[PDB]
Amino acid sequence: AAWLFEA
Amino acid sequence: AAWLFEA
Amino acid sequence: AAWLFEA
Amino acid sequence: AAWLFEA
Amino acid sequence: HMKEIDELTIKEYGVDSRILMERAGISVVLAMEEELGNLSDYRFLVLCGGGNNGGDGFVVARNLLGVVKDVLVVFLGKKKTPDCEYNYGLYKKFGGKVVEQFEPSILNEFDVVVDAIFGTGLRGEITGEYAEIINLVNKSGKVVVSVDVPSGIDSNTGKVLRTAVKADLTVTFGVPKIGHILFPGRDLTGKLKVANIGHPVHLINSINRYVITREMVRSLLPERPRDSHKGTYGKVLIIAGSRLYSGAPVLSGMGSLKVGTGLVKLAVPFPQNLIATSRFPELISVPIDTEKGFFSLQNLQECLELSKDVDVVAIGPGLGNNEHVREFVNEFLKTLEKPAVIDADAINVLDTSVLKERKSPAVLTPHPGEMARLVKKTVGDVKYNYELAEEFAKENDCVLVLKSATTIVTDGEKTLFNITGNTGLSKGGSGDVLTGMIAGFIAQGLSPLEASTVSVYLHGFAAELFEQDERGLTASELLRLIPEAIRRLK
Amino acid sequence: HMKEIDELTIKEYGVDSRILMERAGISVVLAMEEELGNLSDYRFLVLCGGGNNGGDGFVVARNLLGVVKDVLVVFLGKKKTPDCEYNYGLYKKFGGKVVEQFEPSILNEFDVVVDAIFGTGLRGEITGEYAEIINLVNKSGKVVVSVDVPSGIDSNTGKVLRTAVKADLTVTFGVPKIGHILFPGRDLTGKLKVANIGHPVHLINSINRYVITREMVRSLLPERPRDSHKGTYGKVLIIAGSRLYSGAPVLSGMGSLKVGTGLVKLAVPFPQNLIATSRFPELISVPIDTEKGFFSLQNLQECLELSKDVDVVAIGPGLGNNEHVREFVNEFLKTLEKPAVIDADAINVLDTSVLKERKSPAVLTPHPGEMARLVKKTVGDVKYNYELAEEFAKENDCVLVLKSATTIVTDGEKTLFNITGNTGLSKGGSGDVLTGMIAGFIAQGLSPLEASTVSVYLHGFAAELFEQDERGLTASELLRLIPEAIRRLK
Amino acid sequence: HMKEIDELTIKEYGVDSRILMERAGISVVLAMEEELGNLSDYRFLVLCGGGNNGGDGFVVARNLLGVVKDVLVVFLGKKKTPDCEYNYGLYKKFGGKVVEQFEPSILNEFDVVVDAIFGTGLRGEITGEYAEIINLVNKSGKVVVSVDVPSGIDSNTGKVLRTAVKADLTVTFGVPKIGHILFPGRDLTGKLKVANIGHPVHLINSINRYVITREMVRSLLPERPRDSHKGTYGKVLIIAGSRLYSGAPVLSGMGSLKVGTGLVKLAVPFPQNLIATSRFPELISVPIDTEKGFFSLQNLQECLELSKDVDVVAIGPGLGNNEHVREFVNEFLKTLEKPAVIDADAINVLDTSVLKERKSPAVLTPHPGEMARLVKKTVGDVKYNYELAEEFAKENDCVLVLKSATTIVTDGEKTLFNITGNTGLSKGGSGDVLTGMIAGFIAQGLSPLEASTVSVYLHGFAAELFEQDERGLTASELLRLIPEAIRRLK
Ligand SMILES: [K+]
Ligand SMILES: [K+]
Ligand SMILES: [K+]
Numbered sequence A, B, C, D: 001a002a003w004l005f006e007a
Numbered sequence E, F, G: 001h002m003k004e005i006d007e008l009t010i011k012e013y014g015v016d017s018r019i020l021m022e023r024a025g026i027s028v029v030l031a032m033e034e035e036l037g038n039l040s041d042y043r044f045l046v047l048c049g050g051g052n053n054g055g056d057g058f059v060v061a062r063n064l065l066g067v068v069k070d071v072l073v074v075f076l077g078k079k080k081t082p083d084c085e086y087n088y089g090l091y092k093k094f095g096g097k098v099v100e101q102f103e104p105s106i107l108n109e110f111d112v113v114v115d116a117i118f119g120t121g122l123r124g125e126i127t128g129e130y131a132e133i134i135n136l137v138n139k140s141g142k143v144v145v146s147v148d149v150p151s152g153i154d155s156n157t158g159k160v161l162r163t164a165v166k167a168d169l170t171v172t173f174g175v176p177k178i179g180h181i182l183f184p185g186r187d188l189t190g191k192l193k194v195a196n197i198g199h200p201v202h203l204i205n206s207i208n209r210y211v212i213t214r215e216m217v218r219s220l221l222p223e224r225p226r227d228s229h230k231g232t233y234g235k236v237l238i239i240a241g242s243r244l245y246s247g248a249p250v251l252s253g254m255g256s257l258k259v260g261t262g263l264v265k266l267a268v269p270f271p272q273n274l275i276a277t278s279r280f281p282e283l284i285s286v287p288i289d290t291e292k293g294f295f296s297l298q299n300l301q302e303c304l305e306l307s308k309d310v311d312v313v314a315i316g317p318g319l320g321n322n323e324h325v326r327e328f329v330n331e332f333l334k335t336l337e338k339p340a341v342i343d344a345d346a347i348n349v350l351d352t353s354v355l356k357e358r359k360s361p362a363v364l365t366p367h368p369g370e371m372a373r374l375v376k377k378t379v380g381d382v383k384y385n386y387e388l389a390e391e392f393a394k395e396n397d398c399v400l401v402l403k404s405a406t407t408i409v410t411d412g413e414k415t416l417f418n419i420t421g422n423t424g425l426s427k428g429g430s431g432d433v434l435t436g437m438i439a440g441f442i443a444q445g446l447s448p449l450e451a452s453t454v455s456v457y458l459h460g461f462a463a464e465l466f467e468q469d470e471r472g473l474t475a476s477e478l479l480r481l482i483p484e485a486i487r488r489l490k
Helices: E003-011 E017-036 E052-064 E082-093 E104-109 E128-139 E185-189 E201-205 E214-220 E248-258 E273-279 E297-307 E323-335 E344-349 E352-357 E368-375 E386-396 E430-443 E448-464 E475-489 F003-011 F017-036 F052-064 F082-093 F104-109 F128-139 F185-189 F201-205 F214-220 F248-258 F273-279 F297-307 F323-335 F344-349 F352-357 F368-375 F386-396 F430-443 F448-464 F475-489 G003-011 G017-036 G052-064 G082-093 G104-109 G128-139 G185-189 G201-205 G214-220 G248-258 G273-279 G297-307 G323-335 G344-349 G352-357 G368-375 G386-396 G430-443 G448-464 G475-489
Strands: E043-048 E070-075 E112-116 E143-147 E169-173 E191-195 E209-211 E235-239 E263-269 E284-288 E312-315 E340-343 E362-365 E399-402 E407-410 E415-418 F043-048 F070-075 F112-116 F143-147 F169-173 F191-195 F209-211 F235-239 F263-269 F284-288 F312-315 F340-343 F362-365 F399-402 F407-410 F415-418 G043-048 G070-075 G112-116 G143-147 G169-173 G191-195 G209-211 G235-239 G263-269 G284-288 G312-315 G340-343 G362-365 G399-402 G407-410 G415-418
Touching: E003 E017, E003 E201, E017 E052, E017 E082, E017 E112, E017 E143, E017 E169, E017 E191, E043 E052, E043 E104, E052 E070, E052 E082, E052 E112, E052 E143, E070 E104, E104 E128, E214 E448, E214 E475, E235 E248, E235 E297, E235 E430, E248 E263, E248 E273, E248 E430, E248 E475, E263 E273, E263 E297, E273 E284, E273 F273, E284 E297, E297 E323, E312 E323, E312 E430, E323 E344, E323 E352, E340 E344, E340 E430, E344 E362, E344 E368, E344 E430, E352 E386, E362 E430, E362 E448, E368 E386, E386 E399, E386 E407, E386 E415, E399 E448, E407 E448, E415 E448, E430 E448, E430 E475, E448 E475, F003 F017, F003 F201, F017 F052, F017 F082, F017 F112, F017 F143, F017 F169, F017 F191, F017 G017, F043 F052, F043 F104, F052 F070, F052 F082, F052 F112, F052 F143, F070 F104, F104 F128, F214 F448, F214 F475, F235 F248, F235 F297, F235 F430, F248 F263, F248 F273, F248 F430, F248 F475, F263 F273, F263 F297, F273 F284, F284 F297, F297 F323, F312 F323, F312 F430, F323 F344, F323 F352, F340 F344, F340 F430, F344 F362, F344 F368, F344 F430, F352 F386, F362 F430, F362 F448, F368 F386, F386 F399, F386 F407, F386 F415, F399 F448, F407 F448, F415 F448, F430 F448, F430 F475, F448 F475, G003 G017, G003 G201, G017 G052, G017 G082, G017 G112, G017 G143, G017 G169, G017 G191, G043 G052, G043 G104, G052 G070, G052 G082, G052 G112, G052 G143, G070 G104, G104 G128, G214 G448, G214 G475, G235 G248, G235 G297, G235 G430, G248 G263, G248 G273, G248 G430, G248 G475, G263 G273, G263 G297, G273 G284, G284 G297, G297 G323, G312 G323, G312 G430, G323 G344, G323 G352, G340 G344, G340 G430, G344 G362, G344 G368, G344 G430, G352 G386, G362 G430, G362 G448, G368 G386, G386 G399, G386 G407, G386 G415, G399 G448, G407 G448, G415 G448, G430 G448, G430 G475, G448 G475
Parallel strands: E043 E070, E043 E112, E112 E143, E143 E169, E169 E191, E209 E415, E235 E263, E235 E312, E263 E284, E312 E340, E340 E362, E362 E399, F043 F070, F043 F112, F112 F143, F143 F169, F169 F191, F209 F415, F235 F263, F235 F312, F263 F284, F312 F340, F340 F362, F362 F399, G043 G070, G043 G112, G112 G143, G143 G169, G169 G191, G209 G415, G235 G263, G235 G312, G263 G284, G312 G340, G340 G362, G362 G399
Antiparallel strands: E399 E407, E407 E415, F399 F407, F407 F415, G399 G407, G407 G415
16 A cells, blocks of 8 residues: 555 | 542 | 545 | 552 | 531531541542543642632642642632631642632633632622633633532522533532532533542431432342242232323333233223233233223222222323313222322322322322422422422322432432433333332332332433433333343342 | 536636646545555556546556556547646656557456546537447456546436446545436446545535535434423424325334434324324324224314424325325415425325415425426436426425435525435335434424434434345334434434 | 756656645645544644745645644745745635744644755755744644655755754655665654655656665575575685684674574684584684784684685674784785675774775675774764765775664665664674674675675664663674564565
């Protein structure tokens, strides 16, 4: 679940 | 446990 | 958690 | 919860 | 009475009034700690009048000094009583801050308002500053803790004297006051704690008006000896219904059975009597042949004959109110030498002379509208009027059960208050269940006052056990919940 | 209106249309990610028209580039609008692949179809290529995500314009459209997400047609003050039943009680009135003496007398439709100066002149067959015809509740849509419950429009709470579920 | 570079700069929602400069309008760039409130500060108003969200330019900046989210400096084919220890074994060599006969002979620094035609000419104190100086691993940053473990740069897996945790 953000 | 208070 | 979507 | 007693 | 209990405790037992005032304040602090958790994170605003309620507030404020984030006292009175003065002096010597001017925005910098403005010394309406401050506290959304009684509640009646504080928590001393128990005061009180502040237990116990408690009801519940038969648990006759009101008999009858009565008989105009057994075939539902679907004098002898074999008779639910019902009800009660439970339409046609002349006991179960008609006053003059209830019980030699969100049960000497229940009971059918419960417990051996006490409690507690939203509760669901209420009681 | 909200947002507020188009596309991507999990495993086929819906598609496709396994756009239009052109140009500069020819087998190499062919700019029937492609997508078994509205759904009516895309997920912008709410469009829409793409909140809120939501119904639920009695919660009279239809009264009456009404009275021809109290003895079921088992003018005065003591009257369920019932219903409604809830057979005999001449309010609760007869049109012309409903409400000064899988509730100015419920409600008895619920909430103080809103919602939600298969739901089980629906609402 | 990536995305790819600015602001809103939950309860204070960082802030503020409790923008700049101006204009047209004067107490009425004063356009020290406001925000205890980089952090170095904002959350665009990765900036950044705002993925990927990630390290881990023997996994020689430092060899040797090396041999002065096998009898610990407890030229030939049979040699831990060790280390590295890992005291005596003249590869693993001595600068000039590190690697043909809370690993072309680990590694012995890990992975087939990348990561991750307080971590516990770190990596 990572299209917008990388942690 | 009721010396001080009644509910 | 509802700024973008309403269900 | 410590107004009356310290352990 | 409780203010006479303070006096005796000081004057005859010799407890310094300063000691009682100290115990009162610290009880408030412990009660808040029990409700809020650790107090050290909170900023407290203590509103103190010039009377002993305010003195209690000064004790609270002083005992929070150096333990919590901030304390400020707003002193609102003119003079100080001696104990308030002493405790105001202590607060200041301890480093406490007091102001005498209240600025509307002062609430912004505090988390908890301790309301020690007026307690049992409230006289007349609150106006001016006192009022503007109470209104501001009510609009502020803070946590409010009232000392003794919320300011503005008349502690003897529960009435709001123009305006009053709405508390999240009220800490009272010795015993609950009538104003915490009757509405609107019960509503304003929020959660109520009763603190022991050192009165002799003998005096606390000599109080003649009581809240009905689970412990009291548990010890009144009749015994179920194993070697028993239906006759052990008594027989009820219910005289009820009419062609217009065919459901009332069924709800009253099952009320008796669900509390453990051995046998219940209904006397109901044919063919409405068949309604009961089609729903609950355990009931005996005797057909009464009537001229027009209502009881009348023509049925007097049949109903007296049916009464010989029973222990108690309930009369009234669904009878209708017309002159032939009036003749029948009054001539019946005049000749019935059995305990009677008198409800609903039997109350509406009742002649009170009849109650005076009866050897046997009676329980009357009016709502305020019925009680108003019965004594010829307005609803507003009888509602929550426990002294009127006591007078009426005493003059007419009966037990009076005056139904409302708080129910009053009195025989003239002893007065009890019931606070179980919810708004699901504000629905037709629910009174009919109660009438059966009462008759049922009388049939089992309880006195009329004991029967009424246990019933009002369990009837309210059953309602609280409904699993879904209370507004959807009906009398049939209530019947189903009665045996659970009894089980939970033990 | 929403297309006027786009214009205002661009033209008066000054938001670049390219910015709104970007926000729309990225919302689609986030919505898919929320439904499908990580997108990187999936191959996407984006079908783009030449309008702004297609431009939204180009934004979607470009934002999937280099993040997912494969993207291909099939561009199906002729011209491109300026924003579609801009976004088509971006897609290509970003390395995107576009084709203009659609080969039947192209679906084989993709997992997800993004349908951005036609949105709110659909005019007339879809034919030729556009249609063959929609049919192929529908036969393909892939996951389908529609941008704005599934292509082929008229966004103002919910009608299918010859053929339409069946979506698993539809992402719409600003507000739900009427075509997502009414069938068949609601069915084709699949799961619906409404994305905020940056319209001013003031404009989004000025929309005059709304879906009824849990939040709205929660804030309309009446208060249950603790110090209350049955009269606080009002009194309903239900005039219903006949020798042919003895069950309707019971279901309506318990509908009122289960939503919290204090007292419910039924007026029902003798002896069918006894049916109600044998099932639910909490009800008062008055016998009406009739000539042949139906209400007639001979009963007019008794029913007006019974009306004096109540807050609202419901009339219609099970009355029968013959001329004597027609005379009675119309003369009754003409003289009753109380709010009226008018259902079923009272609708079938109603003279609409009577509604115009009434001072007091009315709620009419027809299904489309009843509404068709009432305005003298076909079922097909009235079904889901919310403009006709609005006109009728406004002309006759009433609230109209037009029942179907989506129910429309309007008073002529405000129109609401209800989407709770399931096919268990497509069964006799279920309308009778609703009529009682409405009367009940009116009795408790809600206006007719508010009463209708809360009732249609809770009636549908109760049905959804049935534990077993919905097709086995009956009106009695539904009654039992109402208090759970109310509890879950809070 | 990233600011050149913005330009290309606007100028060559044709994305409107307003679109990138919009995507940036909304990313900030989603990021806050993910960290704070529902935003509607919170009051937001947005501090906006006049540059594009502030424009991002105006976008944030506008998108909170009408959704949250309160928004206020304090605009602190003089001029506005065109995109900031456009977005300031939108905020106002949307009904937004802006002030230009900052009152110290303004923080009291807000819950969240959005810091959009300076981003990557920060030049020189922050002074005057800008500074007083940053200091007030830092003393205020509110939740702080920084747009792009906390204001006052140099985005190329991580240095604080006189004063800087301490954020709970920083949302950055495209890629992490060096200033989020190096300290003090890494500390000020708080929790970091990297948002995709629509740059082409090709450009984002062409960035030549990277954070070492779990995914990268997973794909570099060597394979363990089932049909294998110890020789498959290579052989390490460690040349280490002295009479003063007998522990270093053991920690380096077990570092090699715990990462999967087949065989490890230590060459250690007698009798300190026996220390290793008494602790870990799996190690081979060869006695070197020395004159005074230190390696010297007399041992050169024995150590070159021991080197013939191995794949990599690690040298330095615990050797001591005196002239005879210097002669030996430099003559050894000059003749060893094997990859070398050079640590600790071998760095302190190293002649850098020797590295240039070597055919075989080397990894140097200095801390800043060792790197300072090696290039003859101050600790302050070399610490976190990744450009100096790159120059040194490139000139001397080696991989440089410059150890600190963030470790830099470079070969001159590719530079990587490691952010795993904790303060438990700031303790003697911990570097010796790392040296073994590196030698070990080289022995297994990884190139020197790959070996160094995987090792710094796993060494830090092992430390994070310590169960008790990190300050109690010792190198022996760290050795025990390495196989868990490797397992968790997959
Ligand atoms: K008080
Ligand atoms: K579409
Ligand atoms: K910033």
